[PDB]
């Protein structure tokens, strides 16, 4: 659309404060993928026994 | 203290500013109170590799439960992936990819003085290329 | 006449803000009374010899 | 991003920039995209077959952004 | 213990859960007994661990505190100059643009065991009279954090012998108007200002856009008693 | 000042023993034991 | 300090930045298009039952 | 290969020994605990700092049955006797006879270890109900 | 914190889950008294601490150390009461490597059981 005072503005923002403002170091952790498969084959496995 | 509702981790960061005057000489570190309200959310960009999340259900390692502790101490060695466990894992990535929420990057397997591979490695990576 | 003792004022209320934030801050929560009415062992260590 | 299973070998006498090549295209990528070094001796594991090992690293090779 | 706090870092990159606890078996459904789960889950929960220590270093992992300190160009100047000038017995005032630049600088304050206040735009009226009338009295309170908008006019502060230009804003007026809160009848020590510009940036053109305003005062105001 | 083999006092608070020293009232009990105490006289 | 700086911005930063711009914009579009046919199915019921 | 000096012998009695507190309080101040020990020709009191006693009170030492103290380091171990064994009618707890000679005893205790021993015990664990 | 002991009380509650504790402490200049919470009377209280004691506290820590008794061989420490210094830890590669693998990895820095840490460890 339009943009040109904000990218002085940012770049002031960023010569000013530096690692923030967008983003901090964070806390990692893992990933938690949690579709799993034990209850796909919970159902089969109780039918079985 | 700091706890994550995703994964259950829990951290206790240490003992409140306000009781600052307790023992001339006591041991414990003193943190302020944190700022904002107590719950909040954040989104985050993570990249993953397929084996780290084949790795993930393959065998896990789990955290600060005792009973994930020991489950995760009586197997201490690696073994093979069955195929059923790579096609569960295919389907997976492709409903979040397809969900909008992911996107798939492939990348490059370098192989550096390939004259040590045997005939059977040989025959097996042959058969493993024509794959999808 | 009014003013002026209106300022006055300003200055003793002032004065015991200052005089109140230092009790706030002097009272502290030392008051556990870890002691009860209760049987208690008390042990010292020193070395005196007069 | 179309193709998949593509298989390119450089061959040539020693000192030649091989390795060089190989690292120069991994650089040349981005850090965003996975590139897994790997040597033939690397395969032969202990606890685990071979070909385990080579599907292994196969899966380590691409990448999920998430 | 503390090679171990300090040489542990990394985690996992995924994990699953349902997955630990189907691995022992110990899950609501197994076709282990529902009682003797119970067994053996009371006689763990009784059992103690010794590495719960490494347990909780390799599940979550905290990014640091000092980098904040590290990780930004003009932070560390200003903690040496602070501390040069605290160890001299100094007070300072410092000045900047943004408001997300004042809670950025408290806690980087509350690192060093500061004593500080604040003053921006959206203190009530009755307690930043309050405040400044602390300031100007009161010698253990080291640092006074300004809005350049809200407390960059008429003010009366005179402890502080420092002004900081953490930040430019555009035209020099305001900066003059911003420096000169503390030296202006009853400031009995030198005043000295200092300001932060980063080399090879954007900022620096800017404060040269400024200078060349204040020289403009210089050649037009010539009043005053007339011969 | 190093006499001896170092000084270390004891005591028992707070002004109120309920039966002879409570220290030596419970040596006096697993001496024998509650039954053989109870049994002793 | 060309190199590095390259290498770092095609990793970007921005770049995440538009990947989640693009997520928000594809989950709005389902969201945008669950209400649509919700919408639809409300009316051709109301249709009907009069 | 290194000595140790030790106190065994049957309790002949036990005692605490009230004295003035040093502070200011009102109360019991015990500043020694004299315990008597008797054993085969030799009998002897003996003066001990007070804070010792919750090592009697740990070990159920009991009066007369048994008793063995190191010198410098403090604590007590409790190794009934067969003076009272007769006794009883019937009981589940050992006895060992009168201890030999002087109460007082000099020790020289000499062992041999390979370092191979060292390396194993210091790598294997041990312990009980510990994971 | 660095010195000589000059003295200690202590003050257990018997059947109480609290305990009151406070010593002093002495160098060659300074002089003074502190209070103590719990963990700070258990740590005093597993190594027999006299009043004829020399004691070194690490606040971080809180680990007892026994420099010797100076009666009841080691002149009594001078100087302030608190002072700083600095420590290395120094490590392989290889045992960081070792450490961040599994959980127990930590056990493998001695009994040498670890088997193919995972690449992307390294
Ligand atoms: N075009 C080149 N420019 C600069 N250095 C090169 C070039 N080609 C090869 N080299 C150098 O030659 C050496 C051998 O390269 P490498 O590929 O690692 O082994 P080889 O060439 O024997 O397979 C490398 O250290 C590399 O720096
Ligand atoms: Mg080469
Ligand atoms: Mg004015």
Request: hydrophobic share 35%; with cysteine; proline share 3%.
């Amino acid at each position: 659309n339009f943009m040109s005072i904000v990218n002085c503005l940012m770049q002031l923002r960023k010569v000013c404060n530096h690692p923030n403002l967008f983003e901090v170091r964070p806390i990692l952790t893992s990933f938690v993928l949690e579709h799993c498969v034990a209850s796909d084959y919970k159902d089969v496995e109780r039918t079985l026994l | 203290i700091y706890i994550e509702a995703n994964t259950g981790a829990v951290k206790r960061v240490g003992r409140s500013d306000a009781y600052a005057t307790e023992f001339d000489l006591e041991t414990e570190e003193y943190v302020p109170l944190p700022k904002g309200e107590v719950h909040k959310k954040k989104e985050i960009v993570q990249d993953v590799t397929l084996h780290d999340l084949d790795v993930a259900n393959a065998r896990p390692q789990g955290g600060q439960d005792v009973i994930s502790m020991m489950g995760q101490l009586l197997k201490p060695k690696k073994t093979e992936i069955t195929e059923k466990l790579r096609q569960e894992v295919n389907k997976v990535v492709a409903k979040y990819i397809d969900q909008g929420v992911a996107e798939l990057i492939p990348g490059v397997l370098f192989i550096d003085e390939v004259n040590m591979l045997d005939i059977e490695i040989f025959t097996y990576l042959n058969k493993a290329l024509e794959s999808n | 006449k009014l003013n002026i003792l209106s300022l006055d004022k300003f200055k003793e209320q002032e004065v015991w803000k200052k005089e109140n934030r230092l009790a706030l801050q002097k009272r502290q929560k030392q008051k556990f009374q870890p002691n009860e009415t209760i049987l208690q062992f008390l042990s010292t260590a020193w070395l005196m010899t007069p | 991003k179309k193709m998949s299973g593509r298989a390119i070998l450089l061959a040539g006498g020693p000192s030649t920039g091989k390795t060089a090549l190989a690292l120069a295209i991994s650089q040349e990528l981005g850090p965003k995209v996975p590139f897994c070094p790997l040597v033939g001796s690397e395969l032969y594991s202990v606890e685990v077959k071979k070909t385990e090992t080579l599907m292994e690293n196969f899966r380590r090779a691409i990448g999920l952004r998430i | 213990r503390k090679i171990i706090d300090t040489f542990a870092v990394l985690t996992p990159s995924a994990v699953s859960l349902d997955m630990r606890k189907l691995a022992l078996g110990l899950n609501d459904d197994s076709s282990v007994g529902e009682n003797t789960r119970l067994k053996v889950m009371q006689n763990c929960f009784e059992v103690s661990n010794p590495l719960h220590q490494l347990q909780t270093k390799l599940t979550i992992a905290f990014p640091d505190k000092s980098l904040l300190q590290y990780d930004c160009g003009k932070l560390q100047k200003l903690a040496i100059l602070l501390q040069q000038l605290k160890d001299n017995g100094h007070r300072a005032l410092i000045f900047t643009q943004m408001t997300k630049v004042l809670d950025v600088l408290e806690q980087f304050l509350n690192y060093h065991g500061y004593l500080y206040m604040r003053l921006d735009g959206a203190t009530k009226i009755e307690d930043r009279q309050i405040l400044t009338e602390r300031f100007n009295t009161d010698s253990r309170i080291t640092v006074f954090i300004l809005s350049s908008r809200s407390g960059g006019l008429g003010i009366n502060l005179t402890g502080a012998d420092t002004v900081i230009f953490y930040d430019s804003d555009w035209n020099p007026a305001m900066d003059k108007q911003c420096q000169d809160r503390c030296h202006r009848i009853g400031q009995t020590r030198d005043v000295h200002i200092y300001r932060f510009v980063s080399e090879h940036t954007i900022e620096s053109n800017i404060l040269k856009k400024a200078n060349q305003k204040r020289q403009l005062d210089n050649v037009v105001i010539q009043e005053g008693d007339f011969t | 000042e190093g006499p001896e083999q170092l000084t270390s006092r004891n005591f028992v608070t707070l002004y109120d023993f309920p039966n002879a020293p409570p220290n030596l009232k419970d040596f006096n009990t697993n001496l024998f034991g509650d039954r053989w105490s109870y049994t002793n006289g | 300090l060309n190199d590095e700086l390259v290498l770092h911005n095609k990793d970007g930063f921005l770049a995440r930045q538009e990947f989640l711009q693009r997520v928000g914009s594809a989950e709005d579009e389902r969201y945008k298009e669950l209400r649509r046919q919700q919408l639809a199915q409300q009316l051709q019921q109301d249709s009907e039952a009069s | 290969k290194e000595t140790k000096e030790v106190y065994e012998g049957e309790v002949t009695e036990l005692t605490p020994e009230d004295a003035e507190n040093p502070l200011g309080g009102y109360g019991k101040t015990i500043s020694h605990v004299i315990v008597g020990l008797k054993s085969a020709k030799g009998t002897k009191t003996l003066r001990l700092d007070p804070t010792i006693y919750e090592s009697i009170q740990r070990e159920k030492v009991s009066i007369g049955d048994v008793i063995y103290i190191e010198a410098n380091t403090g604590a007590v171990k409790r190794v009934r006797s067969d003076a009272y064994a007769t006794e009883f009618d019937l009981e589940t707890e050992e006895y060992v006879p009168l201890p030999k000679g002087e109460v007082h005893k000099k020790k020289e205790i000499v062992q041999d270890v390979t370092l191979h021993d060292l390396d194993v015990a210091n790598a294997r664990p041990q312990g009980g109900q510990d994971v | 914190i660095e010195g000589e002991v000059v003295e200690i009380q202590i003050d257990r509650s018997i059947t109480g889950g609290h305990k009151q504790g406070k010593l002093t402490i002495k160098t060659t200049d300074m002089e003074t008294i502190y209070e103590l919470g719990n963990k700070m009377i258990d740590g005093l209280t597993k190594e027999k601490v006299l009043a004829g004691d020399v004691i070194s506290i690490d606040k971080a820590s809180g680990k007892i150390t026994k420099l010797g008794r100076s009666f009841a061989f080691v002149q009594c420490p001078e100087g302030e009461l608190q002072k700083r210094k600095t420590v290395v830890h120094t490590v392989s590669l290889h045992e960081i490597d070792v450490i961040n693998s599994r959980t127990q990895g930590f056990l493998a820095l001695f009994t040498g059981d670890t088997g193919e840490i995972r690449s992307e460890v390294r």
